[PDB]
Design a protein around this ligand. Structure first.
Ligand code: PC1
Ligand code: PC1
Lengths: 69, 105, 98, 140, 80, 115, 171, 347, 120, 175
């Protein structure tokens, strides 16, 4: 459990820290903005974590359990 | 004529399934358990019209938890920007995103 | 919402336009009805499996179950026509007009 | 079809002619397509060509009804210079009635149509003036 | 009732055997002594996590260690 | 993924045999080898005439009994439930409903054949 | 709407128990016996806080105590533990049944040289209590003020004034 | 038909209606609707005639389409709302699909193309069971979801129902098609007031059920399914002509009869919302309904048609049929006006 | 529209508050009218089954009168209970919200202007 | 075009639905719907629904094996049409395939179509969870609590199936 929470926070921090260097010249955007009205923690969907990584990790992580025989 | 006999005889027929935030076998929460709890407890007993007029924020947050569509628009915008910046040629992915990263455990 | 949701609901309304425009055969319309129910079942199961609603998992299959409990009835409403008419064309089914 | 009626009522009456006439023609065309689709639905056309002939007939008749109604209202309100008078709409209703009698090739139908949709156009005009509601929202 | 039973046993023994098995399966679990053992066997399976509780200082039953004698044991299934 | 590979390999091996069976040997066809087989005589009419089939109710009630099976099939995981009394009582109830349907079929002359 | 407050990557940078599944399963009972206090503290604060951004110190202590336990295993009973987790890892389902001799040797060695008792069946599944000091979160769900409910009905049931008052019906 | 099997079938359809009444779950609502379908289907096939098979096929296909539309509305509401409580809906398109499903189930126009053939192809008791008991469950569902009902859609369906029912009833000689189009007109009158005061809808439903059951009981008693035989009933009994005259005057909308009780108060719950021209139009189409009712009364009671010589034999045997609560339902259908405020028991 | 009042406790014909109301007297004109309805129903049974209308089956007429009077008394009790509930909720809401319903000063006729239209 | 496997299976689903929605003949319509049900079961298996996908597979196989028996029994014409032996069947099949490719091209280009509701062009795998459910599958306890929690539902389902049996017996009696 401790490993899972630390990895989830690390992946979210990695995704947030690279969102700044890509979206600068666009107008009227606040980086890292949440889409929820409350500040309470939510369990992140899979697109927020691996939405910037390669596709091999996608088919090895999303469908990996189902496709393992 | 909604003859609510489930409260007259005190017998539970289909109140155990009708709501996502009910009692589940082996205590498994759904994907929007907290949002369901907030939306029920905020909009309890005050009427549907007052619930819609006053408890709109938590219902909106619950609908965003369920559909996740605003997150889809966010991911679409950042991915279109990423594809564009690769296509012109002023972006290079880091080794962490490319795969050779040596994950935490 | 998504993409597969769009595909499944478009399949439902395609099968609805298939049912709502007949082609002179009752059992083909029954097949289109069971197709509409297939789209309904697929949509419900996918919606539950996305939303992790475990305790509602009885509802798709039971829905499926009840559909068969009427679909055979449609088959039971076919041979009776075949016990009066030679075939099962709907353009022959116009006795109730007077 | 919620925008055709509003666009009809978005322009002041008796001020400009062709836009109001074309708006009424479009409303008539939508009504004609609806009634012709129902007519070919419940009643089977003998052929595809006869069915599209019936559809075009109903479309042309209803488009002429709407165009002549809007036109006659426009010149009536321009000549009398009275935008808030339903008599222009009554005159347009009789013009539409004469149009219906001409396209259906009848005369008593033309006079009855004069009276009937002239009264209907007048009821529409004082419904707009006095703010009557066909579908009243629930209040009590 | 013996003559009727002999008659149905002579005509079709399959129905007699099926109804005997059905009656046994109906009336025997209501006379079984190990049904409550099955109840505690099913109830004692640790599927989810046993989360602890906060302490106000007044609890005589719950332990602070898994090896403390306080708390429920599982000796009955170990012996059986 | 491996299921898809196994399916594709099985379909490839299946459809390769008929292609080998067809396009390899020499074909020589006339208008008698392609004729329908009726024990050496011409067919009386066509085979598309409606069969006066007699077990229509047996097929429909096969469907209904398969749906009874669909109700009775998740029973093993219900063996791990806590409320055992309701489980046992209603599994027995559903099996009894199946038996009631079968017994009503037996008494009201449904398992036999028409004509 | 709102903004997210994510922890820095430096705080998450902590060494790990870099072992496998079979090694963790072989010493699972003794880890659950010896190291119950930090694990139970972490589980309780995670259950009552429901926020991983505030649940890092207890996870750090759990990780450090787990690595300390494995270091104590490494210092005294290395080779029987290697044999135990090797023959555990050979099995596909990681069955505890096919490793009786190795398990007996491992528990005998760790009892004779470190004095740890393997818990019996169901002992690790008991509910426990934790002598913690963190305050109970009064608002764990980050909610807001509840709307005011409608007023109830009060007073006696006086009869209707002048009947039903419906058109000409006096009563 | 076997009496035990028929009793089981009737218990099944009443159980399905009760399940729709008492459930707080959409799946149980649909299950009760399916049970209602599957139990009413063999009621129409009690006589084993080709007309019954045609009517059963049309009914089954239309109600199956309605059931599938209802399921799609339920799934859309689930996906946009995440629960199953029978309350207001959280999507306009789900409201559309459920309103079309309930209109198809009720027979409201322009989905009225199945009610007259279905009523004609089945006997009188099956027609009674259809036109009375199938108008309770969809009314309960519409009572449950009236916050989410679009106003323009339900009002357009209501006015179309009343106009189409009157124009259909103007040109039918068969009694059962007359009953079907009168039922469409009463359906429109009943569902026009649903969004303003549903107690008026329940009151009009109760009065319509009482009057329609009274008329179908009189038709079963006289064993007549045609206008000419209904005229010939004058020689068999004068009392039957008196009751058919007073009942068909009651369903016309004349005071001081009971049929003036609901409809007038419908206006009393529609002028309070400042809707003036709509009750006037519906009163005009009620006058059309009264016109075909008046033609039927002229046929049966006010003019004695010539008879045949065979009916003298029928003078030697009294009516041995079982008239189920006929005087009570006739009295309730005729003289319920001085007890008008009793509708307050429906709150 | 009283469904909220019938929200917490359902399927009750006469709740506990209904016992605190004065019940209808047996000499109520509505009860007499419902008894007349039952008598007319008994006459209709004497008529439609080809029996004498005013003497045949006095037990049937008495049963009809008694049943009609019974159900009429209970329905009238429910009716006046519901109307009392309506008026009590009325007065409770009119005590509860005085800001949205102010008072009116009824002016005299010595100063309010009226327009007189002559008839001639 | 790899992680669009759910999209590809849904496209084959819509293709088979358009194919059997032409209503050419009950056997060929059954074949088209069976292809559609196969790829729909593939969708449900790819979303972790092993039991539900296999159940809809087995139920559809039984039901339209019965449908095959019925169309070979009674509802048969002398010359059944495959897809091209009649004009309107091929016309509506080509029409449905053209609209199918129409919103395919609409969803692969702008990634957001608006047909009644709005729809996105990404795969559904983005909404699937990142958490692990331990030593069990959740749908299994759904259909296991079917017997314990589901009292009224199982009672009415069994009664409805029994009523279906008695109704189907009563309908085809004749006298
Ligand atoms: C899988 C491992 C190996 C298996 C064995 C393989 C080798 C042997 C194969 C033999 C040949 C098989 C094929 C040929 C026959 C095919 C036809 C056939 O099988 O027909 C079935 C035959 C048909 O019977 P029939 O043909 O005699 O039918 C006549 C019917 N009456 C009398 C009504 C006119 O039998 C059955 O249907 C019975 C089913 C099996 C019964 C098993 C009983 C087990 C014990 C029950 C309890 C007994 C104790 C009493 C109750 C106690 C209660 C507490
Ligand atoms: C389990 C595995 C099974 C695998 C398949 C079976 C194994 C053997 C495969 C080859 C079999 C021989 C060729 C196919 C059969 C030919 C039959 C025959 O008589 O053909 C005569 C024919 C010649 O006869 P023909 O062309 O005059 O036609 C005879 C029919 N008349 C005269 C009426 C028109 O052979 C051929 O056409 C040649 C075929 C290819 C031969 C090899 C070419 C070179 C390959 C390197």
């Amino acid at each position: 459990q401790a490993e899972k929470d630390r990895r989830v926070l690390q992946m979210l921090r990695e995704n947030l820290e690279e969102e700044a260097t890509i979206m600068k010249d666009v107008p009227g955007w606040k980086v890292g903005e949440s889409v929820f009205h409350t500040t309470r923690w939510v369990t992140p969907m899979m697109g927020e974590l691996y939405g910037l990584r390669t596709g091999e990790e996608i088919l090895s992580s999303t469908y990996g359990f189902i496709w393992y025989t | 004529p909604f003859f609510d006999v489930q409260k007259k005889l005190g017998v539970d027929l289909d109140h155990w399934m009708t709501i996502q935030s009910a009692e589940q076998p082996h205590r498994i929460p759904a994907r929007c358990h907290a949002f369901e709890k907030e939306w029920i407890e905020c909009a309890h007993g005050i009427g549907s019209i007052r619930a819609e007029k006053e408890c709109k924020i938590e219902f909106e947050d619950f609908r965003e938890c369920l559909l996740r569509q605003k997150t889809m628009k966010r991911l679409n915008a950042i991915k279109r920007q990423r594809d564009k910046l690769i296509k012109e040629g002023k972006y290079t992915p880091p080794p962490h995103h490319s795969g050779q990263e040596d994950l935490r455990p | 919402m998504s993409l597969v949701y769009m595909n499944i609901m478009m399949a439902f309304t395609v099968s609805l336009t298939g049912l709502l425009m007949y082609r002179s055969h009752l059992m083909s319309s029954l097949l289109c009805l069971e197709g509409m129910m297939l789209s309904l079942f697929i949509l419900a199961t996918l919606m539950i499996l996305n939303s992790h609603f475990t305790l509602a998992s009885m509802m798709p299959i039971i829905l499926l179950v009840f559909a068969a409990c009427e679909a055979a009835l449609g088959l039971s409403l076919l041979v009776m026509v075949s016990n009066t008419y030679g075939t099962d064309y709907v353009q022959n089914l116009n006795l109730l007009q007077c | 079809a919620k925008t055709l009626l509003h666009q009809y009522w978005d322009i002041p009456e008796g001020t400009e002619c062709h836009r109001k006439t074309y708006a009424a023609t479009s409303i008539g065309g939508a009504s004609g397509l609806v009634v012709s689709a129902y007519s070919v639905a419940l009643k089977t056309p003998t052929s595809f060509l006869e069915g599209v002939a019936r559809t075009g007939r109903y479309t042309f008749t209803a488009a002429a009804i709407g165009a002549i109604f809007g036109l006659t209202s426009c010149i009536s309100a321009q000549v009398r210079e009275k935008p808030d008078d339903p008599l222009n709409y009554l005159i347009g209703g009789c013009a539409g009635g004469l149009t219906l009698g001409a396209r259906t090739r009848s005369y008593g139908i033309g006079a009855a149509a004069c009276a009937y949709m002239g009264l209907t156009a007048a009821l529409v005009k004082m419904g707009q003036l006095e703010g009557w509601k066909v579908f009243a929202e629930p209040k009590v | 009732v013996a003559a009727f039973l002999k008659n149905v046993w002579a005509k079709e023994p399959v129905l007699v055997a099926s109804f005997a098995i059905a009656g046994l399966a109906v009336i025997l679990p209501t006379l079984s002594p190990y049904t409550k053992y099955s109840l505690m066997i099913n109830r004692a399976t640790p599927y989810n996590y046993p989360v602890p509780l906060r302490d106000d200082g007044n609890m005589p039953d719950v332990p602070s260690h898994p090896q403390d004698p306080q708390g429920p044991s599982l000796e009955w299934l170990k012996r059986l | 993924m491996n299921l898809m590979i196994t399916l594709l390999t099985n379909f490839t091996l299946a459809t390769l045999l008929v292609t080998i069976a067809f396009w390899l040997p020499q074909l020589n066809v006339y208008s008698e080898k392609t004729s329908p087989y009726e024990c050496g005589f011409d067919p009386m009419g066509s085979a598309r005439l409606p069969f006066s089939m007699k077990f229509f109710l047996v097929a429909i009630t096969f469907l209904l009994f398969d749906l009874e099976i669909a109700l009775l099939l998740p029973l093993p995981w219900a063996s791990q439930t806590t409320n055992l009394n309701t489980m046992l009582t209603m599994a027995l109830l559903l099996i009894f409903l199946l038996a009631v349907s079968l017994a009503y079929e037996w008494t009201q002359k449904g398992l036999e054949w028409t004509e | 709407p709102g903004i997210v407050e994510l922890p820095s990557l430096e705080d998450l940078k902590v060494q790990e128990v870099k072992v496998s599944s079979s090694v963790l399963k072989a010493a699972a009972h003794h880890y659950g016996a010896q190291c119950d206090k930090p694990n139970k503290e972490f589980m309780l604060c995670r259950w009552e806080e429901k926020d991983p951004r505030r649940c890092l110190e207890e996870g750090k202590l759990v990780n450090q105590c787990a690595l300390e336990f494995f270091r104590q295993i490494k210092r005294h009973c290395a080779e029987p533990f290697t044999e135990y987790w090797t023959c555990i890892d050979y099995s596909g389902l990681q069955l505890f049944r096919r490793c009786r001799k190795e398990q007996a040797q491992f528990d005998k060695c760790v009892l004779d040289k470190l004095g740890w008792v393997r818990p019996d069946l169901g002992e690790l599944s008991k509910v426990t209590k934790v002598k913690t000091d963190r305050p109970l979160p009064e608002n764990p769900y980050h909610s807001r003020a509840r709307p005011e409910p409608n007023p109830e009905v009060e007073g006696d049931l006086k009869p209707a004034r002048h009947g039903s008052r419906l058109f000409f019906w006096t009563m | 038909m076997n009496p035990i099997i028929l009793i089981i079938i009737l218990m099944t359809v009443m159980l399905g209606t009760i399940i729709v009444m008492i459930s707080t779950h959409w799946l149980l609502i649909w299950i009760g609707f399916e049970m209602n379908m599957l139990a009413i289907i063999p009621i129409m096939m009690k006589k084993h005639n080709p007309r019954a098979t045609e009517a059963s096929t049309k009914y089954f296909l239309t109600q199956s389409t309605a059931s599938m539309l209802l399921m799609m509305a339920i799934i859309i509401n689930l996906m946009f709302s995440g629960q199953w409580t029978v309350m207001k809906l959280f999507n306009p398109m789900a409201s559309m699909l459920m309103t079309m499903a309930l209109a198809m189930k009720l027979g409201m126009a322009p989905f009225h193309f199945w009610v007259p053939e279905v009523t004609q192809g089945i006997p009188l008791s099956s027609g009674l069971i259809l036109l009375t008991w199938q108008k309770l469950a969809p009314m309960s569902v519409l009572y449950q979801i009236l916050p989410s009902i679009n106003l323009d859609l339900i009002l357009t369906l209501s006015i179309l129902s009343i106009t189409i029912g009157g124009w259909g009833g103007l040109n039918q000689t068969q009694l059962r098609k007359i009953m079907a189009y009168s039922s469409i007109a009463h359906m429109g009158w009943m569902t026009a007031v649903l969004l303003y005061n549903p107690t008026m809808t329940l009151l009009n439903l109760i009065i319509y059920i009482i009057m329609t059951s009274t008329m179908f009981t009189l038709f079963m008693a006289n064993s007549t399914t045609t206008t000419l035989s209904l005229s010939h009933t004058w020689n068999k009994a004068p009392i039957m002509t008196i009751l058919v005259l007073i009942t068909l005057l009651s369903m016309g909308g004349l005071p001081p009869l009971s049929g003036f009780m609901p409809k007038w108060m419908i206006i009393q719950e529609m002028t309070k919302n400042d809707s003036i021209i709509l009750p006037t139009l519906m009163a005009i189409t009620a006058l059309l309904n009264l016109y075909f009712y008046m033609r039927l009364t002229y046929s049966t009671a006010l003019t004695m048609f010539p008879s045949t010589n065979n009916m003298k034999m029928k003078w030697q045997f009294p009516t041995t049929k079982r008239m189920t609560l006929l005087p009570t339902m006739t009295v309730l259908s005729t003289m319920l006006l001085p007890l008008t405020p009793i509708l307050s028991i429906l709150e | 529209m009283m469904t909220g009042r019938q929200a917490r406790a359902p399927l009750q014909f006469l709740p506990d508050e209904a016992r605190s109301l004065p019940p209808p007297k047996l000499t109520d004109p509505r009860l007499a009218y419902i008894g007349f309805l039952g008598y007319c129903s008994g006459l209709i049974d004497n008529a439609i089954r080809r029996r004498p209308v005013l003497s045949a089956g006095l037990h049937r007429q008495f049963l009809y009168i008694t049943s009609f009077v019974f159900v009429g008394y209970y329905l009238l009790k429910r009716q006046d209970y519901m109307y009392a509930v309506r008026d009590h909720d009325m007065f409770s809401y009119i005590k509860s919200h005085p800001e949205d319903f102010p008072e009116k000063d009824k002016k005299t006729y010595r100063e309010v202007f009226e327009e007189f239209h002559p008839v001639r | 075009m790899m992680t669009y496997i759910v999209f590809i299976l849904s496209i084959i689903f819509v293709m088979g639905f358009v194919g059997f929605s032409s209503k050419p003949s009950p056997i060929y319509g059954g074949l088209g719907l069976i292809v559609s049900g196969g790829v729909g079961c593939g969708i449900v298996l790819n979303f972790g629904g092993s039991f539900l996908g296999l159940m809809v597979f087995l139920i559809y196989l039984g039901g339209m094996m019965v449908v095959f028996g019925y169309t070979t029994a009674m509802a048969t014409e002398q010359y059944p049409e495959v897809w091209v032996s009649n004009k309107v069947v091929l016309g509506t099949f080509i029409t449905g395939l053209l609209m199918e490719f129409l919103m395919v091209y609409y969803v692969l280009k702008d990634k957001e179509v608006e047909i009644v509701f709005k729809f996105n062009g990404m795969g559904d795998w983005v909404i699937y969870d990142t958490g692990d459910s331990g030593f069990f599958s959740e749908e299994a306890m759904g259909i296991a609590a079917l017997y314990s929690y589901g009292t009224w539902l199982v009672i009415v389902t069994g009664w409805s199936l029994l009523i279906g049996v008695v109704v189907i017996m009563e309908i085809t009696r004749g006298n």
